[PDB]
Design a protein around this ligand. Structure first.
Ligand SMILES: *[C@@H]1O[C@H](CO)[C@@H](O[C@@H]2O[C@H](CO)[C@@H](O)[C@H](O)[C@H]2NC(C)=O)[C@H](O)[C@H]1NC(C)=O
Ligand SMILES: *[C@@H]1O[C@H](CO)[C@@H](O[C@@H]2O[C@H](CO)[C@@H](O)[C@H](O)[C@H]2NC(C)=O)[C@H](O)[C@H]1NC(C)=O
Ligand SMILES: *[C@@H]1O[C@H](CO)[C@@H](O[C@@H]2O[C@H](CO)[C@@H](O)[C@H](O)[C@H]2NC(C)=O)[C@H](O)[C@H]1NC(C)=O
Ligand SMILES: *[C@@H]1O[C@H](CO)[C@@H](O)[C@H](O)[C@H]1NC(C)=O
Ligand SMILES: *[C@@H]1O[C@H](CO)[C@@H](O)[C@H](O)[C@H]1NC(C)=O
Lengths: 49, 49, 152, 90
């Protein structure tokens, strides 16, 4: 089966590249939504608002 | 990010007294190379069959 | 079988190019909106034309793309101040029209919110609305009434 | 599962704990500074003053908050309880 997939390894490379791009795309999607502040702030101990 | 605590009070404010002018760089592609591909030159060569 | 495989490869390339063209259309629409708002005027959308208060943007040509040199407004130095929402004078409540009440140690001033510039509290920078009981954190002071001296 | 035939899944770079930490930090920033922390250094402001600032952007004035602050606070707490109860009931 691998001997005959030597002829379609280029399609396999295209699919693998597309899947890797999709994975890094979803990894990058979270950074633009939640990682807007680079400083981690906190609330006061006494909650008088 | 940096772990910092902001002081909060019901009668305390922070207002700035100085400012700095900053320049932010953004890269946004609008187009790419245009390619035209036809089956006659790609799939076939110089054969009628 | 050569024709079928070549057709399959061409169709895969066409679908990939179409997806890339759709992404390019999305990016170009975003760039066109940015050029229409941040470049062709001042955009009030916060954190859209760069980090900080947007002033203007300078677009420049790029190979197969565009870049924007946004000019922002970020503060650098800040201070600490004791503030009050309202001030009591004579059984009346004075609120700042375009400012905030702040005290350093014993005197109360009205300043603009985004920059520090103390001014004397008068009846031209404050408006009277109601009595003293309704407001929670009210503070006693005197308003200048700039007219009295002039009328003498 | 679906991983028995070479279809392995990739864990995300940021787990749910880091998303929760980011959301908590953003919530603390917007309740302790308003919008200055999202556009530069983080200042400090009382929440009634932030509410007055937000009121002065929709065509209303600031004294109508300082004169019925208790009503507005009770309404907001009731709204938070109502949305939590509605979410509990997909
Ligand atoms: C606001 O910040 C600017 C930028 O640092 C200050 O300008 C500097 O002032 C010092 C002393 O006056 C000079 O030695 C520097 O050369 C200045 N830098 C620039 C880029 O001009 C300014 O003084 C600050 N203002 C206040 C009130 O703190
Ligand atoms: C708070 O600010 C006021 C006004 O800037 C200060 O009052 C001045 O203080 C200087 C310093 O001695 C005097 O020369 C002026 O005559 C004062 N002006 C008035 C109108 O009285 C005050 O000292 C500041 N308080 C603190 C604790 O810094
Ligand atoms: C602000 O001023 C008001 C009135 O000038 C003060 O209210 C008086 O308080 C004293 C004792 O606290 C009472 O004996 C008076 O009857 C009150 N008068 C009125 C009209 O309410 C108030 O105490 C002052 N606040 C501060 C912090 O000094
Ligand atoms: C002055 O600013 C610092 C900054 O953290 C703060 O801790 C302090 O409480 C401020 N002073 C007063 C009197 O509020
Ligand atoms: C601010 O909160 C503290 C603690 O709850 C309280 O003692 C103080 O009276 C409050 N001040 C105002 C002006 O509400």
């Amino acid at each position: 089966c691998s001997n005959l997939l030597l002829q379609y390894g280029s399609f396999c490379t295209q699919l693998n590249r597309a899947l890797t791009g999709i994975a890094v795309e979803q990894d990058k999607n979270t950074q633009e939504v939640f990682a807007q502040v680079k400083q981690i702030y906190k609330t006061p101990p006494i909650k008088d608002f | 990010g940096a772990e910092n605590s902001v002081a909060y009070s019901n009668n305390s404010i922070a207002i700035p007294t100085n400012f700095t002018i900053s320049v932010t760089t953004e890269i946004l592609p609008v187009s790419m190379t245009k390619t035209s591909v036809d089956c006659t030159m790609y799939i076939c060569g110089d054969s009628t069959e | 079988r050569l024709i079928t495989g070549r057709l399959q490869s061409l169709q895969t390339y066409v679908t990939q190019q179409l997806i890339r063209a759709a992404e390019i259309r999305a990016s170009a629409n975003l760039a066109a909106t940015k050029m229409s708002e941040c470049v062709l005027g001042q955009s009030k959308r916060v954190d859209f034309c760069g980090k900080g208060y947007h002033l203007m943007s300078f677009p420049q040509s790029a190979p197969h793309g565009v870049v924007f040199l946004h000019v922002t407004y970020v503060p650098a130095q800040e201070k600490n101040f004791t503030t009050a929402p309202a001030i009591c004078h004579d059984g009346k409540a004075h609120f700042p029209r375009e400012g905030v009440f702040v005290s350093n140690g014993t005197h109360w001033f009205v300043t603009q919110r985004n920059f520090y510039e103390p001014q004397i509290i008068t009846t031209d920078n404050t408006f009277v609305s109601g009595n003293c009981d309704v407001v929670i954190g009210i503070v006693n002071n005197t308003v200048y009434d700039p007219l009295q001296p002039e009328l003498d | 599962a679906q991983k028995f035939n070479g279809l392995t899944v990739l864990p995300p770079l940021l787990t749910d704990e880091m998303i929760a930490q980011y959301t908590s930090a953003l919530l603390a920033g917007t309740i302790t500074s308003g919008w200055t922390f999202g556009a530069g250094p983080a200042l400090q402001i009382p929440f009634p003053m932030q509410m007055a600032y937000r009121f002065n952007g929709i065509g209303v004035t600031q004294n109508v908050l300082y004169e019925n602050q208790k009503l507005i606070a009770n309404q907001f707490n009731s709204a938070i309880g109502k949305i939590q109860d509605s979410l509990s009931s997909a």
